[PDB]
Amino acid sequence: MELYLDTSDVVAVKALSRIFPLAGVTTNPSIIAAGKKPLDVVLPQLHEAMGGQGRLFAQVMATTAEGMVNDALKLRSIIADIVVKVPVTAEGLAAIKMLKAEGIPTLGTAVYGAAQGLLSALAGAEYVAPYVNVIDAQGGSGIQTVTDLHQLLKMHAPQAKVLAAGFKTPRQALDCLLAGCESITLPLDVAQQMISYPAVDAAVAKFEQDWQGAFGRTSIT
Amino acid sequence: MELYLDTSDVVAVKALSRIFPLAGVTTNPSIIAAGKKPLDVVLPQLHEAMGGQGRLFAQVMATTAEGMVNDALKLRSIIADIVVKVPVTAEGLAAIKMLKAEGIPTLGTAVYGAAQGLLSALAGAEYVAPYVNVIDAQGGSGIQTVTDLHQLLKMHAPQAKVLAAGFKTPRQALDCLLAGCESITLPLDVAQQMISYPAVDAAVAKFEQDWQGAFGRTSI
Amino acid sequence: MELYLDTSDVVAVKALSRIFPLAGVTTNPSIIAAGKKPLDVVLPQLHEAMGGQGRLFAQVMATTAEGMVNDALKLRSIIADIVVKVPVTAEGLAAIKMLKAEGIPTLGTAVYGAAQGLLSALAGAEYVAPYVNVIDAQGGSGIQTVTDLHQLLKMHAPQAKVLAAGFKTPRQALDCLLAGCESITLPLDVAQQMISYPAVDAAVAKFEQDWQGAFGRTSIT
Amino acid sequence: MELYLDTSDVVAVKALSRIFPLAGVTTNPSIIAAGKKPLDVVLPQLHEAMGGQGRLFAQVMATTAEGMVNDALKLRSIIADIVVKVPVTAEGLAAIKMLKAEGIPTLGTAVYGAAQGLLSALAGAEYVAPYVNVIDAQGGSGIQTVTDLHQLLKMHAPQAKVLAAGFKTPRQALDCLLAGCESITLPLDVAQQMISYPAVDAAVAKFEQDWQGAFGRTSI
Amino acid sequence: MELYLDTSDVVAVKALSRIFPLAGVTTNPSIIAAGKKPLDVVLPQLHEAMGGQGRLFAQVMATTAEGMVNDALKLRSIIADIVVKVPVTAEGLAAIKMLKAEGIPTLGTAVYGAAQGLLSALAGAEYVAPYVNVIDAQGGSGIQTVTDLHQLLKMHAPQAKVLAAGFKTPRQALDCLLAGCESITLPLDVAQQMISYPAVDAAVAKFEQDWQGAFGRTSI
Amino acid sequence: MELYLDTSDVVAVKALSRIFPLAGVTTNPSIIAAGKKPLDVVLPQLHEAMGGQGRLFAQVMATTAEGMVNDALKLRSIIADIVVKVPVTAEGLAAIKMLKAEGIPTLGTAVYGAAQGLLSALAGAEYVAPYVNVIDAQGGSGIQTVTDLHQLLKMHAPQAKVLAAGFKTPRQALDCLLAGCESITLPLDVAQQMISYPAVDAAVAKFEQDWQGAFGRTSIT
Amino acid sequence: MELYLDTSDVVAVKALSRIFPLAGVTTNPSIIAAGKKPLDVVLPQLHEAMGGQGRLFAQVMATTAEGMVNDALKLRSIIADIVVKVPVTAEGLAAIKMLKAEGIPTLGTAVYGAAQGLLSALAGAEYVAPYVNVIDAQGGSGIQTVTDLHQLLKMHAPQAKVLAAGFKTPRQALDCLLAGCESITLPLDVAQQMISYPAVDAAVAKFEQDWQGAFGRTSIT
Amino acid sequence: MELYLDTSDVVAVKALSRIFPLAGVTTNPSIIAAGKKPLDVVLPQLHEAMGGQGRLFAQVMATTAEGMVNDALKLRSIIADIVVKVPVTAEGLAAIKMLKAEGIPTLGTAVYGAAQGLLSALAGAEYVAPYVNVIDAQGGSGIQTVTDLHQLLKMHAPQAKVLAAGFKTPRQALDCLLAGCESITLPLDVAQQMISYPAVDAAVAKFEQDWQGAFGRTSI
Amino acid sequence: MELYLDTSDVVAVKALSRIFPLAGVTTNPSIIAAGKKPLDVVLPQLHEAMGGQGRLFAQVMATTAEGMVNDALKLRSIIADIVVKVPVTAEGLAAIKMLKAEGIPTLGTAVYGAAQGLLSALAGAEYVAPYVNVIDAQGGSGIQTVTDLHQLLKMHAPQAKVLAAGFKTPRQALDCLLAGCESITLPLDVAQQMISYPAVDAAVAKFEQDWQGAFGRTS
Structure with missing residues (x-):
């Protein structure tokens, strides 16, 4: 599996x-x-x-x-x-x-x-x-096309990989990865959404609060 | 995978x-x-x-x-x-x-x-x-027949391949390739339709316009 | 169900x-x-x-x-x-x-x-x-699009029907009819293929031969 | 549902x-x-x-x-x-x-x-x-054709019924009936096989033996 | 739905x-x-x-x-x-x-x-x-036969019902009921197993213990 | 079916x-x-x-x-x-x-x-x-949630409808409509993509060219 | 795969x-x-x-x-x-x-x-x-029994093969072969039907007619 | 496959x-x-x-x-x-x-x-x-439990096999064998039913009758 | 397969x-x-x-x-x-x-x-x-997420295993194990429920009664 960024933004x-x-x-x-x-x-x-x-x-x-x-x-x-x-x-x-x-x-x-x-x-x-x-x-289906294309490459051109490209939502990236794509390229807005979740931030907050209210700090010794 | 043209047209x-x-x-x-x-x-x-x-x-x-x-x-x-x-x-x-x-x-x-x-x-x-x-x-199903035939060859005659033949539309060629055919033969009208898409031509046009409107040419 | 010809050929x-x-x-x-x-x-x-x-x-x-x-x-x-x-x-x-x-x-x-x-x-x-x-x-799927479209019309616009159009093979017309299209329009080459079968002609030939070899003609009285 | 015999045999x-x-x-x-x-x-x-x-x-x-x-x-x-x-x-x-x-x-x-x-x-x-x-x-599938045909008639020509015809085995008649055919026509050899089973004859024999070994006859 | 016992045992x-x-x-x-x-x-x-x-x-x-x-x-x-x-x-x-x-x-x-x-x-x-x-x-499948039979009766003879008969286990009775049989007939050993469960007896025991350990009796 | 725009943009x-x-x-x-x-x-x-x-x-x-x-x-x-x-x-x-x-x-x-x-x-x-x-x-599935929600409303609260909201792609709107939503609200960028297709523009161009090359104009009399 | 005839007919x-x-x-x-x-x-x-x-x-x-x-x-x-x-x-x-x-x-x-x-x-x-x-x-299903039997042999007795026997129609032989039987035995009437098709005869006739109407014979030099 | 009898009956x-x-x-x-x-x-x-x-x-x-x-x-x-x-x-x-x-x-x-x-x-x-x-x-499903258990053993404990036990009908034994159990143990009543079929006895009878009516004996 | 307890309870x-x-x-x-x-x-x-x-x-x-x-x-x-x-x-x-x-x-x-x-x-x-x-x-599906995650790891990062965590019922642990997780960590209440069944206790009781009523002991 090969993760690529889809950008000219050097910084x-x-x-x-x-x-x-x-x-x-x-x-x-x-x-x-x-x-x-x-x-x-x-x-x-x-x-x-x-x-x-x-x-x-x-x-x-x-x-x-x-x-x-x-x-x-x-x-x-x-x-x-x-x-x-x-x-x-x-x-x-x-x-x-x-x-x-x-x-x-x-x-x-x-x-x-x-x-x-x-x-x-x-x-x-x-x-x-x-x-x-x-x-x-x-009007078509990107997931169907990627799924079909990956099947075709694996039977008829094993030397080649799908590099799934062009995402407006992380679901699209997940469905391509689940269909078996050995490479993908994320635009910066989708890559950001794939690693930052409110639910996870709340889980981390609660871990800090529980550790605080029992040991008086939020760090390890 | 073996791609064949189905024609006597030398040119x-x-x-x-x-x-x-x-x-x-x-x-x-x-x-x-x-x-x-x-x-x-x-x-x-x-x-x-x-x-x-x-x-x-x-x-x-x-x-x-x-x-x-x-x-x-x-x-x-x-x-x-x-x-x-x-x-x-x-x-x-x-x-x-x-x-x-x-x-x-x-x-x-x-x-x-x-x-x-x-x-x-x-x-x-x-x-x-x-x-x-x-x-x-x-009145039958070419895709069902090709699918069944490919399965039969792979279990009972592994030395043999399906060479799917006779297409009026590229969908038929795709469904044969998806069913696992290790060879296919395209008439010229279907082969042409398989490589030329309006949607792709529009994507290439837009790439030229964007490159023009930022660097003043359409080349490197 | 409404059968249409897709032609300007008056004859x-x-x-x-x-x-x-x-x-x-x-x-x-x-x-x-x-x-x-x-x-x-x-x-x-x-x-x-x-x-x-x-x-x-x-x-x-x-x-x-x-x-x-x-x-x-x-x-x-x-x-x-x-x-x-x-x-x-x-x-x-x-x-x-x-x-x-x-x-x-x-x-x-x-x-x-x-x-x-x-x-x-x-x-x-x-x-x-x-x-x-x-x-x-x-590169898409006409059958999928017609199937989806018919489902959408039946849930969200019941006043409307799919009139499936543009066929190179009778299979395409059959798959549209099986997906539930209440109307279809056949070009002349596809309409011809839908009514003339070699297998049927052979069945009719055999019926004539059997009737001949038992009653000495190929007609009814 | 309409059961037909497929014969000129009057007797x-x-x-x-x-x-x-x-x-x-x-x-x-x-x-x-x-x-x-x-x-x-x-x-x-x-x-x-x-x-x-x-x-x-x-x-x-x-x-x-x-x-x-x-x-x-x-x-x-x-x-x-x-x-x-x-x-x-x-x-x-x-x-x-x-x-x-x-x-x-x-x-x-x-x-x-x-x-x-x-x-x-x-x-x-x-x-x-x-x-x-x-x-x-x-080389096709009669069951697929009958299934498809029955679906087509029920959506697009409700006035009409499939009358499934031409059977070499009772399984073919059963699969047509299960696919929903409102009429069928059986040749005599298939109709016979559909009503006479060895397993049923053995069940009836055992019922007679049990009734015998308890009441001394095989009737009421 | 019609529940029948399959017995001559009057008591x-x-x-x-x-x-x-x-x-x-x-x-x-x-x-x-x-x-x-x-x-x-x-x-x-x-x-x-x-x-x-x-x-x-x-x-x-x-x-x-x-x-x-x-x-x-x-x-x-x-x-x-x-x-x-x-x-x-x-x-x-x-x-x-x-x-x-x-x-x-x-x-x-x-x-x-x-x-x-x-x-x-x-x-x-x-x-x-x-x-x-x-x-x-x-060697066959009773559930498949009952399922197929019920479908056939509902399309081709709506006046009739399946009365599923002959059970060695309650699973067989459940699969017939789930396949849609409007009548069934249970032998006594299967009917008994269908109403008496160890897991239920344990649930009732625990209800008595909890009621005891809070009100000092097992009644109202 | 009830189509809504999801915007404060009056123009x-x-x-x-x-x-x-x-x-x-x-x-x-x-x-x-x-x-x-x-x-x-x-x-x-x-x-x-x-x-x-x-x-x-x-x-x-x-x-x-x-x-x-x-x-x-x-x-x-x-x-x-x-x-x-x-x-x-x-x-x-x-x-x-x-x-x-x-x-x-x-x-x-x-x-x-x-x-x-x-x-x-x-x-x-x-x-x-x-x-x-x-x-x-x-990290979840909007389509699964909408599908489940529509089923729940139709069994347990028939007086209510799903109004599917929040789309980055027209596929998401289509999958909600196919799952049976009796109402939807489109942001302006998705509504635009739902009515303008390159493939359709090419079909219309070809219709004009064929009508031109046979009657010498691109209009009707 | 092993093809057998099911007959005592020496000729x-x-x-x-x-x-x-x-x-x-x-x-x-x-x-x-x-x-x-x-x-x-x-x-x-x-x-x-x-x-x-x-x-x-x-x-x-x-x-x-x-x-x-x-x-x-x-x-x-x-x-x-x-x-x-x-x-x-x-x-x-x-x-x-x-x-x-x-x-x-x-x-x-x-x-x-x-x-x-x-x-x-x-x-x-x-x-x-x-x-x-x-x-x-x-009243049972030969295809189900053959399918189940082949699965059982492949998991529990790999030394053994199904030799599917007793056919009234070529469909039965095809469904056994598709279920994976490594051997089959055809009665003469079914074997005949498996190799002679009206549709194939019509295809060969048309090939002869096209070759005739272009080279004036129905043979090669 | 390992076939076991589930009995203390030595004879x-x-x-x-x-x-x-x-x-x-x-x-x-x-x-x-x-x-x-x-x-x-x-x-x-x-x-x-x-x-x-x-x-x-x-x-x-x-x-x-x-x-x-x-x-x-x-x-x-x-x-x-x-x-x-x-x-x-x-x-x-x-x-x-x-x-x-x-x-x-x-x-x-x-x-x-x-x-x-x-x-x-x-x-x-x-x-x-x-x-x-x-x-x-x-009230549960023995076949589901055996199927799940066999899957679990094959992924997480490959050293182990299911030995499916406790049958009232041969269907239960077949569904366990089809789900992939590498061992099973049959009570005597189920083992008997698994080898003796009326339909097979009728097939053997017919073979004897045909051999009789053509060679005048029922042996070689 | 790797079974873990999810606890600080040493005893x-x-x-x-x-x-x-x-x-x-x-x-x-x-x-x-x-x-x-x-x-x-x-x-x-x-x-x-x-x-x-x-x-x-x-x-x-x-x-x-x-x-x-x-x-x-x-x-x-x-x-x-x-x-x-x-x-x-x-x-x-x-x-x-x-x-x-x-x-x-x-x-x-x-x-x-x-x-x-x-x-x-x-x-x-x-x-x-x-x-x-x-x-x-x-509001989501833990089983779907674990199933998808295991598929992803097996295609794209075979070096890694799912260690399914956080269970209120043994069904959740079973569905994770059936989806192919090569590791799991059970809280103590779920681990207990996974090994103690009323139906099994009744089966053992009946075995003792039958052995008693035929040999006069339970040895």
Whole structure:
């Protein structure tokens, strides 16, 4: 199991790497755009903010296979071991095949369907990222798509893992983990909700009160 | 897992071999007939259009076992490593048994039933091809037949795989893959629908707009 | 239960109305475009080809609610009792609400989601038409969407029916009918496959042979 | 619920009408052909052999709707209240529609699929007869087809009933009855197996022995 | 719901009628034989031992329909409102049909199968009695047979009820009641186990101890 | 079925009342606080923005039953037919009982459990509002709680309905509607996502192109 | 998996051994009686009609264990490697135990119950043959009994296999194979129905017509 | 699987050891009491009646752990390899722990609950014996308890097996075997019912008649 | 499978260690507070009351990770091999990560959610303790949470076990054991109910009566 943060926010990655067991950080174009720092600045910073270990993901922007391969080589010169995210289109699949030949790890992104996702794995991607909340929001079922996709990868492309992406609620992350996803990437608001519960804070308060009212302090000797 | 295109269209095989991870191409008599080129012309062309790698399948035409074995030897002289498709009839099963003895890979085709399909595997076929959409269309369930057939092969003939064939919609291909089929063959219209989605195109458009409105270009 | 043909083909409607128990004919813009005859020509012809009984459906083209209401009034002047098809968008829903006020039957079309479909029913549509094969083809499940939509209509909008639309195989039509759809519309290729079976033809052949080989003819006296 | 015998055997109908609660007798062309007596002879005999009460079913032979309607009028002149069996084809459906207009009860026969069966009900048939064992034998599931068909009739054509037909084993008849079929037609070998059990005969023997060994006879 | 005791033991019927809400008493030949008293003695005694209210059941002994009808008329002259138990055989069904015509309530007994049971209901029986423990013991499932039979009666013969019979354990009686049987008949050993529990006796003991240790007595 | 918007945003209520078939608008303290306008200003504005038809909901602030009853009487003097939202606590239940006696419709809010929710219905509330996303976020299942709550109301308090509240995704609203909720209240971001789909926009575009390429315009005559 | 024919018909065994992959032939007393040829004639003929390869099964007639062991020794002198069919009764089980001691393969036949069948396996039988159609016909479920029996053998007697016997329809054979039976024996009428389908014949006809109407023949060069 | 008889009846053990594949014989206090012969007489007789092969089980009578350990040592001096039955109480568990230390195989008996049964396995028992019919009779479910107990043993104490005990019907024995119990112990009435079926006797009769009517004898 | 008692009651631990196969004893702050004896007194007593064998668990009190690590080192100086219970909060997870680095076994406690519990296992905890009755009582399902948590640990953190905690009834303990928990900790009232049954006592009585009425003694 591989826990990823889904952010370009360097400060928050350094803070949360003390708390969560992070395998790394995932980016997409919208998340880099929101940060307003370009790739040759933010990727090295993100790499340094996890202490120079663990995996980064960034997306190609080009529309053609030849262009997506050049975008990949550009990303690999910024971060030597980066995994190249490639959207799963006709041109996407062709790029994933070429990138397998050159030996550059890829991830099939913008997956809205299990069949689509499996094709990217068979083409050579070692991660496949269905956009859970987007499928959910566009009238379908993100959990069904992730469940189906994980089953397909485990029978037909065992070398590949689902990297479940795009969460508005922790329930979505839990249902993906229960369906068997070997990797997931949390936005910062969902990661926060996953570790801070009112019910737990009340349990800790009561433990302090009971320890106080019996030993006159709230600490150990 | 083995992805096959179900076509005699040489141009489309060359285009799509750049995109899909193809294990090869399947033919039947109707698909060769539609192409209007005979087997000694189209098979070598199809072989060359996937870069000389991966498997071809072509069907015997004869009515008797002895005749189906001769049809097989003719196909093997056109393509040395071709897999012979044999319809699963009384005479079909007898040919599959004879072809196992000679050591020529076969596929049991025109399978409308799980029991029928298993007999072809036990006889020696290493692929079994239920006609999914035809079972579906003729009042039955292609998915139930493929599901049952895959279970039967995995318990009673582990040497054999389902090669699910005959799709009008990508859902049918997905349900066969989810039921565990280790091979499938897509017609060109279904393969196209499986890789091009409006929702994905909109996601890519939005990524370009966001990157534009923050860095002033759409590239790196 | 209401069986509809999904065609502008006047000749085939007259042929098949002798065979199928037709409640009428559904059209969309693409189906009218393929026929190359405009609405004021083809609709009266389609109406005459079912013997001047039964329901017609045709789609508005406008982008605004006010425009969709005018498109509706134009359709009602061609066929007095036509049901107006309205795509289920923001502007679509607003038009359906206005058309309920004026008392013009509407159908919520271009439905890719159960929630979307229910909103069109609550707005006033008395038919809701999920595009079964399109949902199926775009990585989702048409049967799940139709099943969910029918459940929603039966709990929350009992005045409305699912009119399942868009079939590449008869199995899809059967699964919609089994999920409880009170209306369906078949393209001509699927309707043909639903009534002609090789296995049935062989059963009839054998009945003729047995009757021949015992009474010397293939007819009754 | 309506129990039918599926036979032209007049002697066996008279014997079994004493035992089973029969609603009548069903015929098909093959069953009349086997009997070698024509319709104007055997139908009145079958009607008399159930004591002139309950329903008869016989099949049209013609290929066109107009021809199937004439075949129907011929059957109605032999037996005034007969139900006309019509195979569910393009021409079949057209005949069923015409026969509804004239007010002659019909049954949609030779049904190998649920969708097919529902169309015959919507067209006007008040019975629909899926050939259970034939679907079962031709690689499909007769029970699935009957179950689906009954569900379809109850939602979309409540005026119609399934008349399940074609049994090689009593299990098939039980599974159709459990799936909710409001009518069924048994061949003579299956009807016999449904009422005679070794286990029951042993229970009756033991009751006689216990009554003997306590009162010195086996009666009251 | 109708609770019956399955015994000829007059003393035990009078004791248990004070405790259970009895609808009556069922007999079979083996149970009358064990009691060693003949029908014209024991039936009036059993009727009196439930205070002259509620239903009795007794079984015919004859092998032929005409004989089973005479056995029925003999039982009706002993107890005017008795329900005639008839084993479900060829001859059984014919007798049930004749007994419906004469207007004498019957019960189809010695039922080892759901289809068998339904035929007896369609023939006119208003009770059907599958031998639960015997089906269970002879390698099958009494609960499955009772469940199937109850479903069949509720769809196809609503006039009839299952009277589940033959229990070695209270679980069997509970599973029949949960499957929906509107009548059941308990042997004395099972009825006893259904009302006396160690856990309940311990609960009552503890209530007495708590009341003692607070008020100094065990009464009010 | 009763569709509610969950907002104090008067402008957006007037825009969306043209589109959705609204039964009214729900408020809570946090939603009124965000709007920065007090109750005697915003409630009459919200009432006018749905054209003076359909229901409003607002929450009491007090800690005691007697105080919650006074808060209710204050709300009823601002909007004569308002439904009083009461949090389901010890004091909450006591207020709901008193408010039933006086004949003022109430809603049991801040429901994190099915048992809790049923007690508010038995006490006299005619709506019960489980906080779906909050239960989901705090490690539980909002859908399970809503499903259980709806079953409980239908067996044990048939006079009451679930008013499902608090959504981050339209899937959550769909699963509540499928579980049988006879009322729901959508925040503006979820309501928007429920009516606008990329797949539908593409279908409408293609209909315009086909009609263009056959009749030379994109409108009807 | 082991396919057996259930017949004494020597001619039909030789015809069908060309088509089916036969592991051998099963007999019972009724099937030998119908053939009217005694065991010392028909068994060697049946052995020769499958080309002298694969297994034969024949049934003992005796009522006592000592008698069933003698019947076994008589069968083994006709066919050296024959499997002895023993009905599963008190005396049957005792014979199976004795035959295990002497090292003669046995099959527990006339099995109407899963418990009965398991006892024969534990006693030493390496095949157990529930009479599927007879259980089905006598008011029970052959499929349930075979399913239960196969589960029991796989947990409690892994040395043994179900040899499902007695079919009136191919569905019964399919349901036994789907429940996991590692061996089955088909009567000739069921074996025929399992390989000849009208729908397949129509598919082959259409292939010939298409090949004809494009190359002017129905053969390959 | 280990098949056990649940009896002190030496004659019946010798008869049935010829028929059933017995792993041995189980006793309890009530079963020894019914036999009226004490342990030092009946156990060696039972051991000899299965030909001096396979396992015996007998129960301790003492109330305290120290007493149950002495009872165990007494049983081991009568039969060297006997398995000691210990009721699963507070004192029971303590004895099982002590008996594991000394190296004497034990069985946790009088188990009415899955949790109770698991504790006896964790304490060191290598068999756990839920009283199936008693749980069933006292308003609960013996099958549920055995199913749960077997699951618990397989996850949390793999060294231990369920020895299902206490049957009034063969269905109960079958449901325990289907739930996965690796050992079971049958009373004589249930063991008899498990091997003698009327339906099988009729099948054998018919085989004799067919062989007679074709060869003139009933032998080879 | 690892059976734990959930108590600071030294006398009851010594009594019940004769009966149950105990892997050790778990403590929390409230349970130590109720006992009124501090950790440096009660922990060595609890260790001695199970005969110096099997595991002890005690909870940190501090609010910060650095403070929770110091609390851990204090516990390890009282009992060398103790497992440090750590509540699963932001600061909790950070402490669990630091304690994995130093090589001190930890348990993620105060778990009210499956996702929460899995994070503590991924962080390095080798036990995770959902508060079953508290989840049950606060409107949720303890059995669902334990079932989900066990599934998550077995797929994503196989190094870790569920230690199900907080029971008001033996059914709750059974449903956790059936869902596959490889460890559990029983309060004394539930442990007692799990071994003493009226129905069993009646069965033993009847065995004595039958043996009496046939051999004239109860030996």
